[PDB]
């Protein structure tokens, strides 16, 4: 009865400066409720997107977020070395909150 949400893709190589694209879509219409996170490994999860589309403060503006209803985009615009990590997307519109299966996010060679 949980929401299911698939994460696209699961493992990317890119270059520093690449423009990078990550989508979400749930399994029934969550609205707007979606929040993108990133993980270096060890550490603590950081919350950079907040319902769907809006960009938190202390995460830099290269990271940004759109989408509505059942389908949602995850971007970063100029990928930077500290950008290298797995990044998670999360639905809130429906207890329990249920996660993407994650991207991890990884250098070329």
């Known amino acids: 009865a949980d929401i299911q ?5 699961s493992s990317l190589s890119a270059s520093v400066g690449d423009r990078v694209t990550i989508t979400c879509q749930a399994s029934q219409d969550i ?10 490994p060890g550490k603590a999860p ?8 809006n960009l938190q403060a202390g995460v830099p503006s290269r990271f940004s977020g759109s ?9 970063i615009s100029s990928l930077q070395p500290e950008d290298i990590a797995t990044y998670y997307c999360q639905q809130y519109q429906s ?3 249920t996660f ?10």
């Open 5 to 9: 949400m698939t994460q696209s893709p």
């Open 31 to 40: 609205i707007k409720y979606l929040n993108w996170y990133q993980q270096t």
């Open 46 to 53: 950081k919350l950079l997107i907040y319902e769907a589309s």
């Open 67 to 75: 989408g509505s209803g059942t389908d949602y985009t995850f971007t």
């Open 95 to 97: 207890l329990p909150k």
């Open 100 to 109: 993407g299966q994650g991207t991890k996010l990884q250098i070329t060679r």
